[PDB]
Design a protein around this ligand. Structure first.
Ligand SMILES: *[C@@H]1O[C@H](CO)[C@@H](O[C@@H]2O[C@H](CO)[C@@H](O[C@@H]3O[C@H](CO[C@H]4O[C@H](CO[C@H]5O[C@H](CO)[C@@H](O)[C@H](O)[C@@H]5O[C@H]5O[C@H](CO)[C@@H](O)[C@H](O)[C@@H]5O)[C@@H](O)[C@H](O[C@H]5O[C@H](CO)[C@@H](O)[C@H](O)[C@@H]5O[C@H]5O[C@H](CO)[C@@H](O)[C@H](O)[C@@H]5O)[C@@H]4O)[C@@H](O)[C@H](O[C@H]4O[C@H](CO)[C@@H](O)[C@H](O)[C@@H]4O[C@H]4O[C@H](CO)[C@@H](O)[C@H](O)[C@@H]4O)[C@@H]3O)[C@H](O)[C@H]2NC(C)=O)[C@H](O)[C@H]1NC(C)=O
Ligand SMILES: *[C@@H]1O[C@H](CO)[C@@H](O[C@@H]2O[C@H](CO)[C@@H](O[C@@H]3O[C@H](CO[C@H]4O[C@H](CO[C@H]5O[C@H](CO)[C@@H](O)[C@H](O)[C@@H]5O[C@H]5O[C@H](CO)[C@@H](O)[C@H](O)[C@@H]5O)[C@@H](O)[C@H](O[C@H]5O[C@H](CO)[C@@H](O)[C@H](O)[C@@H]5O[C@H]5O[C@H](CO)[C@@H](O)[C@H](O)[C@@H]5O)[C@@H]4O)[C@@H](O)[C@H](O[C@H]4O[C@H](CO)[C@@H](O)[C@H](O)[C@@H]4O[C@H]4O[C@H](CO)[C@@H](O)[C@H](O)[C@@H]4O)[C@@H]3O)[C@H](O)[C@H]2NC(C)=O)[C@H](O)[C@H]1NC(C)=O
Ligand SMILES: *[C@@H]1O[C@H](CO)[C@@H](O[C@@H]2O[C@H](CO)[C@@H](O[C@@H]3O[C@H](CO[C@H]4O[C@H](CO)[C@@H](O)[C@H](O)[C@@H]4O)[C@@H](O)[C@H](O[C@H]4O[C@H](CO)[C@@H](O)[C@H](O)[C@@H]4O[C@H]4O[C@H](CO)[C@@H](O)[C@H](O)[C@@H]4O[C@H]4O[C@H](CO)[C@@H](O)[C@H](O)[C@@H]4O)[C@@H]3O)[C@H](O)[C@H]2NC(C)=O)[C@H](O)[C@H]1NC(C)=O
Ligand SMILES: *[C@@H]1O[C@H](CO)[C@@H](O[C@@H]2O[C@H](CO)[C@@H](O[C@@H]3O[C@H](CO[C@H]4O[C@H](CO)[C@@H](O)[C@H](O)[C@@H]4O)[C@@H](O)[C@H](O)[C@@H]3O)[C@H](O)[C@H]2NC(C)=O)[C@H](O)[C@H]1NC(C)=O
Ligand SMILES: *[C@@H]1O[C@H](CO)[C@@H](O)[C@H](O)[C@H]1NC(C)=O
Lengths: 833, 832
């Protein structure tokens, strides 16, 4: 069975780089704090006890209000008068750094105005190992370079707007099946522990860890560790990924929180590098906690060094100061659990004073504009035989397919979007927000037609094929809508248990397109989906004249598409993953069966770095639409590739500090005038009897055998060769080569080009090409510009498991520039660097 | 069994009144016609043989193209690129003479541009005897005066636009059940003949006939006779309704056509007053006709006199010329039967040249404007507890009801509208038109809210009550949509066989409203429906703050309603029927079971004139919303009632026009390829008997020709006859009535003043509508409304005299805002 090697001690914060000032302030405040106060910062108060999906108790003596953590990566979850933004995958499809930042800011403004301190997003785990993973859509791209840049920009938008961002899920949560014991039990599977992701050290460095290196460098404040195990050690107590990769190598200064139910131990988790327990209890409303009272005790009994807890506190307060949350603080002005104006303060046991729980603050501003624009700029024109744009002179327009119309239960009518009904603008689970409204394509496209006095209808039952065939016959253009949904594992729609069961269009999609294409010579397909779908039955039909993939657009779906359809927006989006002929062509099967008896199912990443396009290229498979493909209403030419060589750190840490003092056990007993709320998780002890007030069956049992070698070592540590900066050693960010190329709009209309820069690092086991740089450049017809980027040391290196460092191998390297991963007209050898 | 007395001979046209020019031109051209050319004018060429729903072969030698007849009373049926107008019942709900006219015009223009010669509408029969009758929505109101005026106005609109209008169905086709033998069989009932409407002579004159008199006087060119019997004589061979009432008493100068399948004999119908057989065959594509060849033979053999068929041809050409159709003529440029560009010229047998059958002509112009307007001005605000108009600032809007949303099969996804899915904008059967698009209330309301930056959702599954309740608890306003549908007999939706099985809201309507109102203190109900529905379970719920009835609005439905909800238009529509507490309160039950063995069911109109309000009032029942009721965003005042007293006996002999030759002149021309199933006027051979193929040919003929049916000599003019729409004497203005109307609220809007009379006597309704108008007033603005009462308006039909008489009982006049809100009344001075 795969094994996860220990790495201890759990590194302490040091005011690294851009954290200097936040660290100073964190230190100065925590120095004043009692141990129980410190513990409060680290532990949620129990599932549904307060306002937010996660909430700590704060430190009221020092005027630090409870921290409020709210989902999701695309807008505020479980609230009102908020926006619903397009999904992370849509951000990926824009290939636009700027839009990523603008969407992050727009979200941080909304979060901030609801009195939420921490956004539970953006996501880059899952990266997208398997095209059928239930949650790829919440993230960006199976490409680490594309994902890391957009991940970082999203994070920067959120944090510049004053809210702590949470990079999740760390790490290797690449599928929904067997991600949680109880969750698998509900589906009839009996396992004792969660799926284990077993990955070699090179692969994790070059793929899954890379966006997280970007996130750390860009200043992310929090990290959420995952439900799965990695080499059979749980994500939220895995010292290798937490202490070694994240904190020692990447130099991460902020705090680590558990996924909700991913916390599996007090002592082990605290020593393996966790900083914060969510929602705070062991299971939802157990009135018990691996931390709270137990963490206070674990410090009093000498098992967890004071310097760990102080470090937990320092990292939490440093992330809070770093985004200036303190300057914006206000209690959450809504409740996640009810929409009522009034309710009991403590929702779950219905206790506390009866008071205002919802203020109905409208936080949307004019964010519909950015959502509308982003939706349009994320619509990938996969195919176009001079079918698009529409002129509005189309005499009779047939809008065909359930995905064009309304959810008959209302846009929000399925709990956490747990259905695929009507147009697909948001996938399901906790990565969701309530729509303020949803503009359907039916609505937007019919309004456009009527504006020009044309005739138009929507048929939205995908087995009404008789009506489809009849109308398609009479139509100038048939616009056919189809979708494929997915989401978090705790919801099953039509037997799809988070992960998709297949990659075929839902609701009779293929049959619908055929019924249309058999009858209109001008049939245009629009796909809303979480990821790639199988297009082989119909994409090359002589009558299917254009095909678009629009992702998950959020509240303005219909308007975003019309802007593209009718040419107000020239599509410039590019596919952020691969469209293959078959499911088999992608490889990377999901583990859908118990393969280690009733133990944790084993998920071996035996493809190594070879996911999505890397894999297709290794196997010499031809995608229908390759990673990086998108058409435009104009054309672009790339020429004049040129390469220019350019002229381009502590060895030990300090010892672990402590801040403030720890007193007697009697200092930490339940204060006397305090009504203890049912299910509420507190940091206090029932009495000075440590064993009895912990109530832990394993209290004091073989204690020293369970504290790992190194785990209590407060002495100065060596700095990893790959470490000592932010997102790695800073030498990895030296710029070694400048690349330039001329990009020209050779067509009739203004448009955005997406230059793409790939390298081949060389070597017998390396992908042919891997993306390194890109930009999105707006160009008027005939306009020319010179696109200039740089390659860093990291960009040209590979992870050397023996050196534990990134190394530029002696294989010769090449640069390639062009319009997709397969359309690379320019190449240049790189000189030795 | 009820019996229908003979009236013969069938009156011939005489260039009466406004017909003098058209008649002269018709006589000039018919005089040049051979017998077979004349017969061609009278007979359709067979079901689905040509382009239109009904089509004659015309007279090519004389440059007269075949006459194309097409549904529907609310827009072109079976075509493309046309408009879908609101139903007749909406026109009624507007109480607006000018809007009825403008709608007629807009339709005429469309029909004209398709190469349609004759529109099969408007409808004032059914009048509306029963609230659950399946085609009431097609017509206007169960009140004869309201219906007569708006029917006439529609006709004038269509005809000034150059298309022949067809007043239908004449007469008493008051329910769908049993209207046809073959339909009754597909529903499991065995009957030998169709339902017989049995009505006394007074009731027919004062109710059912009256709007047909208005039609005739207004100049209607065509009348379509009905599928039902009247006293056990078929509507298309009823000498009493056709020869006496329509032709002799009302002086109709136009032509009468059969409904499709309503022609039941060759000779009997010709002599009983029929002028045109549609679709031309005995049954659909039977390749036989009661006329065509048969009518040629009937003339040649001496059974039908030449003057009768000549008269058919004159009535038909005169109608054509009166509207100016000759100046606007073109062959039909679409096919009712396929949307393809090319096809065989003769659809049913797929024979003839292979050529272009559709030209995709976009006749819509800017008609969407009249439609959107008519829809707004037909939306009756039944209740408003200060809920409306909305301001646009509502924070969160809940749109609730399948009736707000899209038909998931596409607006036209159900053939002849034969379903009730998504918003109800058109009821079903032949009274329909393909939508060019359909704007749903969901689309218009959400677009409105989005324009003000609010939040808004639509839930359109009427059993998703969980989602409905949750959303209603969060909304600033709940807009709840519910409907009830009906249509023509040959279609059945949810076991509603045209007629409604009940007056209850379809698709869980009551439970939906209750589910909303139990949760939003601001629940606003919108009903789309073909007529009244029961509201008593929820109309007075304290959270039900407003109720509107929007009818069948047509293509702009959602924009029509938004315009009203958001105050762009101030509603002035009025209820054109009664909203009762129970189905029992209307009386007038349909005949739903055989009551005469396997003979024709018998439908005794035993209530007489007491339908809708007339009956509610006679039984002192209190309606929830009375006939004439509608609210406004402003208020009005009615005052200062002032009353002021104001200051041919034989026909020609029947003419013949042109000549009849030997049989051999009418044998099939030799060069001519006979299309299968196509109906021609010609004979196989000079053998009359063999050319006819009638098993009864030449058997007992004189005994089957009623006395006088061949009498061509000058006839007495009836006392109630002699003019157009009856004796001119009955249009003398006898009394002038005036009142002052003031807008006393704060919003510009329309008032609908209504004048009712009480004619007095033990058998008369307490109040009967006689005049109305729709007057536009700004806040504080006043106007004088002046109107007159004719001799007809003050009369009752006297059976003994066979005339309209002003009876000696004293009469009153009432003016107000509804049939129950009548603050102004006075005794009328005796007039004679
Ligand atoms: C001061 O106050 C404190 C607060 O009150 C007191 O704290 C308590 O201390 C106790 C010790 O005195 C703790 O109990 C012991 O906990 C351990 C650890 O359990 C957690 O981690 C397990 C995996 O851990 C490895 O990795 C972690 C880091 O992730 C390390 O910290 C561990 O040292 C260990 O490290 C090795 O492995 C990694 C690679 O993974 C390497 O990198 C290292 O190099 C090391 O090689 C994990 O598996 C546990 O998960 C179990 O528990 C979950 C529920 O919590 C459950 O979800 C899982 O499914 C799983 O359940 C199964 O096991 C549990 C009990 O653990 C059963 O209840 C359950 O029903 C299932 O059967 C957990 O997350 C734990 O290993 C200990 O139990 C082992 O040893 C005891 C006997 O001593 C046996 O009875 C158990 O069967 C078990 O034995 C297994 O392993 C043995 C090897 O040691 C082997 O010999 C056996 O064959 C067997 O398979 C104890 O439970 C207690 O957690 C803690 N409480 C709190 C609140 O923090 C403190 O005592 C006090 N001080 C003083 C002085 O009084
Ligand atoms: C020149 O060429 C011409 C064209 O080719 C030749 O034209 C043909 O002439 C024939 C006569 O020679 C015609 O055949 C006979 O037709 C009659 C009439 O049938 C129709 O009318 C019925 C109602 O009639 C009344 O009303 C009409 C006006 O609407 C008047 O015109 C009538 O005079 C009669 O008027 C009386 O009643 C009204 C009140 O209602 C009063 O106002 C008047 O004052 C009078 O009192 C109608 O009911 C018929 O309906 C049947 O047919 C429909 C199918 O068309 C069907 O849908 C109905 O359901 C119904 O079906 C039943 O009847 C038919 C038989 O007709 C069966 O096939 C069927 O199976 C059903 O049972 C129709 O609309 C018709 O009545 C005659 O039939 C009676 O008489 C013969 C004996 O002569 C019997 O054999 C029959 O059984 C039948 O008997 C009934 O009536 C008898 C007394 O009248 C009674 O004694 C019986 O007990 C029984 O109940 C003939 O069918 C032929 O129509 C016509 N052809 C064409 C194409 O026009 C012409 O001959 C030729 N001239 C010369 C000189 O050569
Ligand atoms: C009552 O109503 C009905 C319904 O409207 C009327 O029925 C219609 O009447 C039309 C006559 O008015 C008749 O029209 C004929 O249509 C035929 C089919 O037309 C199409 O196909 C051709 C050929 O590929 C195309 O040219 C054409 O554009 C159409 O697509 C035509 O073939 C007929 O043309 C003939 O007559 C006209 C004048 O009427 C001539 O101009 C034309 O040149 C043709 O004339 C030839 O045939 C006639 C006698 O049939 C000869 O007298 C003449 O000399 C020509 O003869 C030469 O050619 C023929 C064969 O081509 C050859 O055998 C001979 O030896 C010579 O060489 C004409 O246009 C409609 O079809 C008919 N509709 C239906 C459904 O039946 C009815 O008339 C009305 N009744 C009354 C009393 O008004
Ligand atoms: C760890 O976090 C915990 C949760 O944030 C902290 O617990 C809270 O501590 C506060 C302040 O120390 C306690 O407040 C006391 O609360 C009552 C307020 O009750 C109210 O009811 C009356 C009704 O008439 C009303 O008058 C008040 O305004 C309140 O609305 C006061 O009476 C006291 O003066 C005092 O404020 C909280 O109750 C307590 N919360 C819970 C859920 O138990 C805890 O302090 C933190 N621990 C550390 C070490 O910092
Ligand atoms: C601590 O005391 C509380 C209060 O009586 C009791 O309910 C709880 O179970 C105790 N916790 C432990 C670990 O004994």
């Amino acid at each position: 069975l795969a094994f996860s090697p220990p790495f201890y001690p759990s590194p302490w914060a040091n005011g690294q780089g851009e954290w200097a000032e936040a660290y100073q302030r964190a230190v100065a405040i925590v120095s004043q704090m009692t141990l129980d106060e410190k513990v409060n910062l680290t532990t949620g108060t129990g599932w549904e006890l307060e306002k937010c999906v996660g909430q700590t108790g704060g430190v009221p003596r020092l005027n630090i209000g409870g921290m409020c953590l709210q989902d999701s990566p695309l807008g505020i979850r479980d609230s009102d008068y908020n926006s619903a933004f397009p999904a992370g995958v849509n951000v990926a499809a824009t290939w636009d750094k700027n839009l990523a930042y603008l969407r992050g800011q727009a979200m941080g403004q909304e979060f901030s105005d609801k009195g939420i301190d921490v956004q539970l997003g953006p996501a880059a785990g899952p990266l997208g190992r398997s095209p059928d993973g239930g949650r790829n859509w919440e993230g960006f791209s199976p490409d680490p370079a594309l994902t890391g840049v957009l991940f970082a920009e999203t994070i920067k938008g959120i944090q510049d707007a004053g809210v702590v961002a949470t990079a999740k899920h760390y790490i290797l949560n690449e599928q929904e099946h067997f991600r949680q014991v109880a969750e698998a039990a509900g589906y009839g599977f009996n396992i004792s522990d969660t799926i284990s992701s077993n990955v070699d050290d090179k692969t994790i460095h070059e793929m899954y860890l890379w966006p997280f290196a970007d996130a750390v460098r860009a200043g992310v404040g929090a990290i959420m560790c995952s439900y799965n195990q990695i080499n059979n050690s749980y994500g939220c107590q895995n010292s290798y990924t937490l202490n070694k990769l994240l904190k020692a190598e990447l130099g991460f200064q902020g705090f680590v929180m558990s996924d909700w139910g991913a916390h599996h131990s007090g002592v082990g988790s605290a020593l393996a590098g966790l900083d914060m327990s969510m929602p705070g209890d062991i299971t939802f409303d157990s009135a018990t906690s691996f931390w709270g009272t137990n963490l206070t005790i674990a410090v009093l009994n000498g098992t967890v060094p004071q310097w760990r807890v102080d470090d937990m506190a320092v990292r939490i307060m440093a992330a809070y100061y770093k985004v200036g949350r303190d300057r914006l603080y206000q209690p959450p002005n809504f409740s996640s659990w009810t929409r009522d104006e009034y309710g009991f303060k403590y929702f779950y046991p219905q206790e506390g004073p009866y008071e205002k729980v919802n203020h109905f603050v409208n936080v949307q501003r004019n964010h519909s504009e950015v959502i509308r624009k982003l939706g349009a700029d994320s619509t990938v024109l996969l195919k176009n035989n001079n079918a698009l744009p529409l002129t509005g002179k189309e005499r009779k327009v047939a809008i065909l397919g359930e995905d064009a119309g309304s959810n008959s239960y209302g846009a929000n009518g399925c709990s956490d979007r747990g259905c695929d009904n009507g147009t697909l603008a948001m996938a399901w689970g906790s990565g969701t927000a309530e729509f303020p409204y949803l503009v359907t394509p039916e609505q937007a496209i019919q309004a456009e037609v009527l504006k020009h006095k044309g005739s138009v209808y929507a048929i939205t039952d995908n087995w009404a094929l008789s009506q489809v065939e009849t109308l398609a016959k009479q139509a100038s253009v048939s616009l056919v809508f189809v979708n494929s949904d997915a989401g978090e594992g705790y919801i099953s729609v039509d037997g799809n248990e988070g992960d998709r069961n297949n990659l075929t269009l839902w609701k009779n999609g293929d049959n619908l397109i055929k019924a249309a294409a058999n009858n209109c010579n001008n049939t245009i397909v629009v796909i809303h989906s979480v990821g790639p779908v199988l297009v082989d039955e119909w994409y090359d039909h002589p009558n299917v004249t254009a095909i678009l993939w629009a992702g998950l657009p959020g509240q303005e779906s219909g308007n975003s598409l019309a802007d593209v359809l009718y040419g107000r927006v020239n599509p410039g989006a590019k596919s952020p993953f691969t469209w293959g002929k078959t499911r088999e062509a992608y490889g990377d099967y999901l583990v859908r069966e118990l393969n280690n008896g009733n133990g944790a199912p084993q998920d071996d990443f035996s493809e190594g770095v070879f996911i999505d396009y890397r894999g297709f290229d290794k196997r010499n498979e031809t995608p229908i639409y390759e990673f990086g493909h998108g058409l435009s209403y104009t054309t672009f030419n790339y020429s004049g590739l040129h390469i220019q060589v350019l002229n381009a750190v502590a060895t030990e840490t300090g010892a672990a500090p402590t801040f403030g003092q720890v007193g007697n056990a009697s200092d930490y007993v339940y204060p006397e005038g305090l009504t203890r709320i049912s299910k509420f998780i507190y940091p206090w002890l029932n009495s000075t009897d440590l064993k009895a007030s912990s109530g832990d069956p394993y209290y004091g049992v073989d204690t020293a055998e369970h504290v790992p070698e190194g785990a209590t070592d407060g002495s100065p540590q060596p700095v990893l060769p790959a470490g000592g900066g932010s997102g790695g050693n800073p030498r990895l960010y030296d710029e070694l080569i400048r690349v330039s190329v001329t990009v020209k709009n050779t067509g009739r209309v203004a448009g955005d080009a997406v230059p793409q820069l790939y390298v081949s690092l060389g070597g017998p086991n390396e992908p042919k090409v891997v993306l390194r740089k890109f930009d999105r450049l707006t160009l008027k017809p005939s306009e020319e510009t010179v696109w200039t980027t740089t390659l860093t040391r990291r960009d040209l290196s590979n992870w050397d498991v023996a050196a534990q460092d990134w190394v530029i191998t002696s294989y010769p390297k090449k640069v390639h520039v062009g319009s997709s991963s397969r359309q690379l007209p320019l190449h240049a050898a790189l000189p030795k660097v």
